[PDB]
Write a protein that binds this DNA or RNA. Structure first.
Ligand SMILES: Nc1ncnc2c1ncn2[C@@H]1O[C@H](COP(=O)(O)OP(=O)(O)O)[C@@H](O)[C@H]1O
Lengths: 94, 443, 88, 93, 92, 85, 77, 89, 88
DNA sequence: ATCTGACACGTGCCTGGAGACTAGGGAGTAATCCCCTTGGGCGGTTAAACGCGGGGGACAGCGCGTACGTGCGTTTAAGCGGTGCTAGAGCTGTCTACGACCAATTGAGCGGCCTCGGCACCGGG
DNA sequence: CCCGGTGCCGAGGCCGCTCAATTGGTCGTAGACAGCTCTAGCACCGCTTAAACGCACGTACGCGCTGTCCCCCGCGTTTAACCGCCCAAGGGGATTACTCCCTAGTCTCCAGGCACGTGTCAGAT
């Protein structure tokens, strides 16, 4: 096809689905690594990591919508790092 | 083949009373003819019936080839793979109409388990035959749950090692073979009717005998220091004092047994895992820092005095790696096949190791790997650098080199360390061999 | 061949979030084209979020004398941060 | 008491919770009734909107995807769940 | 062993939409939404009690807590549903 | 003039206009009501602070689009990713 | 009474934030965003007041409302 | 209220400075607000664990869950030292 | 009482009043006093130091604001404070 | 140099400190048993990595014109000061009608057990 | 994009039983409310002067248009790692239900601090 038409295909299917992205095993490795720092030998139930993953994905999707707004404000379509850095500054996040 | 004729006399009998049997003839008799001989004997009345035979993959090639060779013709088909299995499903023959061409159905434990739906529809199966009974030694295994959905009016189990771990595996099987099912004699009353184990006794003196000898080693000072720091704690500090490349590392929640077994194997495993140690112990002498390593080295120098090729086994793959590092520094040429290496890659390595001219005498070889049916005979001596916690793996590994084609007499060197969990394990594996040895008494 | 000094190192756990997965999360947010320096930026913002939540969960746990972070410890951390999760 | 008023939610169970939740020393008699009558109203609204959602997708049962959608659609119920993240609920086109 | 409003959330549904099923993991959100709205209101009304230095959470308080949590027109139609009920309970 | 008001801590709106607006917008909630002369002061302080922040984020939003003149699109992009409405 | 928030004042506030040059349609927008804010805070204040049986918006009513909305206000009481 | 103590803390840290009247107000407000946050958190923590006592442990978790960052890591040390001195003596 | 400047007794009383819970331990009043004291000390230090820059011998609302704004921790605890009679 | 603040001080009355009970939740222990590490086996199979065009979009430069800032002279109307008036905030004292509590009573709703219709996955279209 | 037809499994169903919600007297206390004092909020006047307003004028910035070239996307092919199911044995770790003792609230007396009322003083306004 012509570049950009299969991309609008993907922004429709995924907005309609409710199936989670991010493989389950890598996220669970990351959380644990981030944890050993706080309490040595802390164990996570499975439901906990599940919840954490759900929340994270939502956070990132929201950030991604506001970083698209910011980019459009500058008369572009490509979202660049500056946009994220602008979005977070307006939301207060560290 | 008189025994195998008594092997077909007893499965024609089982067919008669209706009961259900677990032929337990020893490994080496063939383990292949007996099974197809019974399938071909059912030609009387009609071989044209539902028939199913689940087994690993390699078993399948041999089975088919034999059905082709010992007997002239038996509609046979290997239902292996997925999606490509859908076409041969119908190309074979009619759906349920069992003509004299309804081809024998040969599947694998995965296929059987994953898509039982397809085969669930078929009629009460005349005889489902499961090659390796040990697969079902757990009564909560998902294969067992999916294996009950099949409407089976008869069952059969092939094995050579009925019990390995304890009696509960005998219990779970007995539900499978017979749902209905001093004291030693009382057990032999229940089991005499079904079990038919012909030892390697009718055929004996087949190969030169072997010697299995345990040569202990004395735990060195540094390992003792590590062990006491593990019996209490601080082994995550005596190695974490440097605090580089990885800080606030996890606790060795490792069951004491296996964190102290890892020590008794080689302390580097802990040190590497603890500190950054971007580089291996380059001391190439610190590797000496393990007593069991030093006893291996001297043994090997005395066994190069003759050059007869050795075999090395281990439980993990980090430890074989340390060994390889050590020897490769000195310069020895090594070949190695663990589970990480690929299949066709490992098959050519053997084809080269089997090359007598080539001087790659050393051969690293993990324990649980190798599947079944490899042919390693160019070597003569096996060194079990670790123990098992299940002696039937040790017997298999020893037999892999103790098989047909070994003219030179074989030794076995089960290394170990005194005043530690290695000696504990040896006692455990010994009592498991004894659990099976008193059972061999029944016959 | 026996590796020399080099042992058997492994890839970092953060690099586990593959570029394909960031793209999929972006397209669900409505984005059209994505630059290339975006990926190394998303990773940091994921890390920060997670670090604030896990810290609270590990606190709420210890107070119960326990050593396992349940799912109710996570739900409380999020509620302290403004995000409320229904369904656990 | 639930019966004396037209409420369908349980007045007694709410009263007990309020009295046993250390919310204060002495709860009055009307406070359990009022709370029940507000909670019932709120639920009815959400459920009524979610139900209108399903028929559209041509299904006769509600799933988290429906409640999310309904909430996102309406303004007041959104100002209310301004941060809530329903599980397995997707996002609005 | 686990108290929940599931029984009552399915009675209101029937009353509003007569012929529609509910499904599971779907009333696992509706129950949570009720528990949370209860908590907020009660806590507000306690703070509203401790502030006004009274030891009693009465109806007046529950009402001023509703007016401050439930956002917008919901309030009005909730307040009404609720007051209606208190007068009704009174003439029993 | 940027420098001057960045060193001062004085009030920037006049007094009585702010009072009237606050009285009217109350009228549509409860007829007849009084207001301590300190309340109208608190309300002014707070409002003035709020507007300064909005303006500081709108300036950021304009520097993004490579301008220096502030425009109504900016206030709106600020207030939307803030969450205000 | 919202035209009493005159053009020079908006300009002064804007130079506190950091703005450099003001457009000309910026004023009506400012006058709207002030009104919304003032309308929320005052509603909450009048609620709190009535709850105390009074007719005088007073000390700690405004402060309490402003707190309620994420804006703690120290002093003024 | 806390005037004397805030006047005392100043004399100790900056021996020669004074403080106006509006400043004292701000300071007292700050102290009171921290107090309230800390205590409310502690009470909630208690309730979630079905406990009728607000012990020290809850004063510490509360300080960790609300004081942000290293600012807390110190406050915890400062509080532990003072409860130890009081208990031993 | 024994160790600090703040009124361990009064803090305790305030905990008894307000009905924060049924029972208050013995250490609970002691710990809170110390934390509040530390927090006040930090703020009073930066402000005076702020006043040591302006050279003003008297701490005024402006200094407190400036100090809170600068330091990275207090700016986080004190997120949106609007000190009366202060400025940016 | 002075006036808007800023600094002593007082009484007293009101609240912290101390001494003690009966109470009574919390620290201690034993138990059962069930989900949770760490290191390896084999077989699936779908997602992720890589390489290569090619085209679209980011970016820089230039030019016109229009809307913003500055300046100066009118004209509002805010700020201050002072006077008058009364609504209503704040507090006190009486007296009950309302909530806690206990006990007797028992039907509503709750854990585990039925079944069958609607709704996901396909190949076929 | 329709279309059957498929199963085929969870959405409704029922059912004793336990405990929790009613209903009735005392039971005391928490509530309303009636009345009085006096603060402070509102309305209005007159005058000064500072901030707002209107209009003219110049020019800096915003926006359209153009051209170059970087780098992102889509596709095909080869890689890889998530995902499943299995070892054995450890051995732990939570939840529940077990039990005794030392501290909470409770009094009760009695100490001596902090709150509203006053005199000083000194800065920076
Ligand atoms: N002890 C024995 N005595 C006689 N024949 C034997 C014995 N052991 C094995 N065999 C031979 O084994 C053959 C069947 O096994 P086959 O499938 O050919 O090979 P494998 O033994 O490798 O499975 C028979 O033809 C039989 O002659």
């Amino acid at each position: 096809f012509r570049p950009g038409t299969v991309a609008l295909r993907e922004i429709r299917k995924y907005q309609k689905s409710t199936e989670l992205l991010i493989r389950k095993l890598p996220f669970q490795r990351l959380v644990r690594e981030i944890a050993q720092d706080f309490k040595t030998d802390l164990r996570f139930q499975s439901s906990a990591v599940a919840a954490l993953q759900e929340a994270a994905e939502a956070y990132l999707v929201g950030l991604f919508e506001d970083t698209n707004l910011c980019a459009i404000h500058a008369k572009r379509v490509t979202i660049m790092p500056k946009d994220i850095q602008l979005a977070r500054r307006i939301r207060g996040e560290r | 083949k008189s025994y195998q004729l008594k092997g077909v006399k007893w499965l024609i009998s089982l067919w008669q009373n209706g009961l259900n049997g677990i032929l337990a003839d020893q490994m080496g008799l063939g383990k292949t003819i007996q099974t197809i001989g019974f399938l071909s004997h059912l030609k009387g009345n009609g071989l044209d019936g539902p028939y199913l035979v689940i087994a690993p993959l390699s078993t399948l090639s041999n089975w088919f080839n034999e059905i082709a060779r010992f007997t002239p013709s038996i509609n046979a088909i290997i239902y292996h793979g997925d999606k490509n299995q859908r076409d041969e499903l119908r190309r074979k023959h009619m759906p349920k109409t069992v003509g004299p061409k309804f081809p024998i159905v040969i599947t694998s434990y995965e296929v059987a388990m994953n898509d039982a739906k397809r085969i669930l529809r078929h009629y009460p199966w005349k005889y489902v035959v499961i090659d390796e009974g040990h697969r079902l030694k757990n009564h909560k295994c998902k294969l067992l749950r999916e294996l009950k959905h099949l409407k089976m009016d008869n069952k059969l189990l092939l094995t050579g090692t009925p019990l390995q771990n304890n009696l509960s595996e005998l219990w779970s099987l007995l539900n499978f073979i017979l749902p209905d099912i001093q004291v030693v004699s009382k057990l032999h009353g229940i089991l005499r009717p079904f079990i038919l184990r012909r030892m390697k006794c009718d055929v004996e003196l087949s190969l030169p005998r072997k010697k299995e000898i345990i040569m202990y080693a004395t735990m060195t000072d540094h390992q003792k220091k590590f062990q006491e720091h593990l019996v209490n704690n601080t082994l995550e500090a005596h190695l974490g004092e440097n605090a580089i490349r990885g800080q606030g590392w996890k606790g060795k929640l490792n069951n004491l047994v296996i964190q102290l077994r890892k020590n008794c194997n080689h302390p580097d495993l802990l040190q590497g895992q603890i500190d950054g140690s971007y580089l291996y112990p380059p001391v190439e002498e610190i590797v000496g820092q393990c007593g069991k390593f030093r006893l291996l080295e001297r043994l090997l120098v005395r066994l190069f005095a003759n050059n007869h090729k050795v075999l090395i086994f281990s439980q993990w793959t980090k430890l074989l790696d340390i060994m390889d590092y050590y020897f490769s520094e000195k310069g020895f040429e090594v070949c190695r096949i663990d589970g990480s290496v690929k299949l066709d890659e490992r098959r050519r390595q053997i084809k080269d190791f089997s090359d007598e001219k080539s001087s790659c005498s050393i051969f690293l070889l993990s324990t649980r790997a190798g599947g079944l049916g490899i042919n390693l005979t160019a070597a003569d001596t096996c060194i079990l650098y670790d123990s098992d916690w299940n002696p039937q793996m040790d017997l298999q590994a020893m037999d892999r080199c103790h098989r047909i084609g070994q003219t030179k007499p074989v030794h076995v060197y089960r290394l170990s360390t005194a005043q530690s969990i290695e000696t504990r394990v040896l006692k455990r594996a010994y009592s498991k061999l004894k659990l099976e040895h008193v059972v061999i008494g029944q016959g | 061949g026996g590796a020399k000094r080099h042992r058997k190192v492994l890839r970092d756990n953060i690099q586990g979030i593959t570029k394909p997965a960031i793209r999929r999360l972006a397209r669900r947010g409505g984005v059209k084209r994505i630059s290339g320096l975006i990926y190394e930026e998303t990773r940091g913002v994921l890390k920060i979020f997670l670090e604030n939540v896990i810290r609270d969960a590990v606190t709420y746990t210890e107070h119960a004398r326990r050593k396992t972070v349940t799912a109710m410890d996570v739900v409380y951390a999020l509620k302290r941060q403004g995000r409320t999760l229904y369904g656990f | 008491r639930s019966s004396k008023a037209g409420l369908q939610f349980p007045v007694g169970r709410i009263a007990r919770f309020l009295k046993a939740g250390k919310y204060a020393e002495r709860v009055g008699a009307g406070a359990p009734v009022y709370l029940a009558a507000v909670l019932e109203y709120l639920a009815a609204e959400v459920l009524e909107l979610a139900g209108n959602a399903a028929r559209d997708n041509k299904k006769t049962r509600i799933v988290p995807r429906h409640i999310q959608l309904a909430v996102r659609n309406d303004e007041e119920l959104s100002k209310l769940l301004g941060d809530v993240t329903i599980a397995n609920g997707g996002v609005m086109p | 062993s686990v108290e929940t409003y599931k029984i009552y959330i399915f009675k209101v549904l029937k009353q509003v939409h007569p012929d529609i099923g509910i499904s599971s993991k779907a009333m696992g959100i509706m129950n949570s939404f009720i528990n949370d709205i209860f908590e907020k209101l009660a806590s507000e009304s306690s703070k509203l009690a401790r502030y006004n230095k009274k030891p009693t959470i009465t109806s007046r308080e529950i009402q001023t807590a509703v007016r401050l949590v439930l956002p917008g027109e919901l309030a009005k139609h909730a307040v009404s549903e609720g007051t209606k009920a208190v007068t009704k309970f009174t003439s029993s």
